[PDB]
Design a protein around this ligand. Structure first.
Ligand SMILES: *C/C=C(C)/C=C/C=C(C)/C=C/C1=C(C)CCCC1(C)C
Ligand SMILES: *C/C=C(C)/C=C/C=C(C)/C=C/C1=C(C)CCCC1(C)C
Ligand SMILES: *C/C=C(C)/C=C/C=C(C)/C=C/C1=C(C)CCCC1(C)C
Lengths: 225, 225, 225
């Protein structure tokens, strides 16, 4: 039921992240414009990082227990480490894409940081009632992140090239929905409520990752710079 | 006596940090000069960060036990996390204020890092005698920080505008004293000696925070840039 | 046998790092060119950081136990913290030396990060078989680091000054060998296999550190900039 029934979704997850990394490694070896290089650096780190964090969830070093609700619950603090580094790089990705000010960057990054850090604390709190208090705060940092993301990576992501507002209206819809999913998924699943089995939650989070991870990598890279 | 008698000073602390954040959020929404924006980004992160870290001290996730001296002691490792991120942002604040070299910045930041990191280790060591060895080292990193702060955020904080040396002679006296307080307070209180009840120590650290946090935020922001 | 027979190599290690820091502190106090300052900032942080991490290994706060193989093993997670910060600064050192692109930097840094972070996880895994899986991955991140280091801090470290390719052909051979040693040493010693006593491993790692730490500091600094 825990650290058992889902290794399949976790094993498949490692496979995907890793071939995903292998892919970006043997498809970025060239690169000319220092700029483009930066974008490739980023798109590789994410998969590689998310790669190892998923291998620790598979092997079991990144799965702990947490007393809450009345019994012992499985919490993959390994996930939290994953996003704890991916989300900011990825965020730096989008930012540098529509070239933003170091002010909205430091804002965003650190903001994202209160989001994930706070979320992690939530995920480890032992008294039920509280888990959701943190769920709420982390959310707020994410609704703020996303806010800047939307109203911004639209406007400040328009006054430029021809396709700018186009490709951009894509990336947004996709990042916005994609992201707001983690908040929900978390909530309904094991690490929060108990409306979704850990068995399903993982599969959900995995589709969730692989997409955000590579998916967003590709789409992102495809947006020239 | 522990994680009990002081919730009042901790509850009041959360209130203050948070309304403090709410304040900077709904008073920075405008901003023009990318520069000014950076300063607002910073002044908000601090309260927000210090906000959540104080809510974890309130709720109890950020309060642990440490065997030293002969009995079990309460240590809010949550404080250490707080300053572990605030102090460097805040430091980046002052630095960018009198526009310094990336050399004195990386120096300062990392220096501050040996200060807090080392301090944290101190706060968690179990053998009495040692606690103070770390107290000493962390201090040294802080006397070095402050050193650059004083002899610098005076000189290198003078050859510019008219009020420069003025406002600046303010900020200094205030940061210097304010800071050197944490070293002392720590020392006389529970997490170190036993000359001050945890009951009082908290109130002291709280006045201490709220001031450093917002106080320094305002004063800081008020210094144009 | 553990946290006992080697304090000598650890005590000598603290001495060396610290006088090493004292040295860079009272030999960098001047400095003119903001640039040179940055290089001095870096060379000091390393010793100072590595200083405190070695004092925690000496005093015993940075030495833990890990069930693997069949019995309890001593693991100085304190080492891992050490390199966890040194290696990236040091890396930033070499990078800025042959002035590289922010792309190869972010790449390198983060890469180094998967190396050390991953290594650390290895060092703490309880099931024998696995330890070496992580040993393998961390290695891969290091063979990639070093790769860029060699084929790069040669070419991209040539088309410049007269001595460039010279001094540079030095620094390389020295960093390359020096580094690849930590991977091997780790492997044959206590924290991995059992072909080397913890008694010897420490002495090895210490010579290893002091050299990388100061040695590389000097050599590095001596390369003007
Ligand atoms: C590669 C991973 C990505 C892009 C992850 C994004 C994750 C989030 C936006 C997570 C958000 C969460 C909350 C808003 C509430 C608490 C639970 C979290 C951490 C899943
Ligand atoms: C918002 C928080 C701020 C500005 C905190 C500043 C804190 C310090 C300068 C703390 C210094 C300490 C020492 C010098 C010795 C060990 C105890 C500490 C960590 C309280
Ligand atoms: C001052 C310390 C320095 C320059 C340390 C460098 C360390 C490494 C390159 C360590 C590498 C390791 C592996 C490749 C495999 C796992 C064991 C490690 C962490 C020792």
């Amino acid at each position: 039921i825990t650290g058992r029934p889902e290794w399949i979704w976790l094993a498949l997850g490692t496979a995907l992240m890793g071939l995903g990394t292998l892919y970006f490694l043997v498809k970025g070896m060239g690169v000319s414009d220092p700029d483009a290089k930066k974008f490739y650096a980023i798109t590789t780190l994410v998969p590689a990082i998310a790669f190892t964090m998923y291998l620790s969830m598979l092997l079991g070093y990144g799965l702990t227990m947490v007393p809450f609700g009345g019994e012992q619950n499985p919490i993959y603090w390994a996930r939290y480490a994953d996003w704890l580094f991916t989300t900011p790089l990825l965020l730096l990705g989008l930012a540098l894409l529509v070239d933003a000010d170091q002010g909205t960057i430091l804002a965003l990054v650190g903001a994202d940081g209160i989001m994930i850090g706070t979320g992690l604390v939530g995920a480890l709190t032992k008294v039920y009632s509280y888990r959701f208090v943190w769920w709420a705060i982390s959310t707020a940092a994410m609704l703020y992140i996303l806010y800047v993301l939307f109203f911004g990576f639209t406007s400040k992501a328009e006054s430029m090239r021809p396709e700018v507002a186009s490709t951009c209206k894509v990336l947004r819809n996709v990042t916005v929905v994609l992201w707001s999913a983690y908040p929900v998924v978390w909530l309904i699943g094991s690490e929060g409520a108990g409306i979704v089995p850990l068995n399903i939650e993982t599969l959900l989070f995995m589709v969730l990752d692989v997409s955000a991870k590579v998916g967003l990598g590709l789409i992102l890279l495809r947006s020239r710079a």
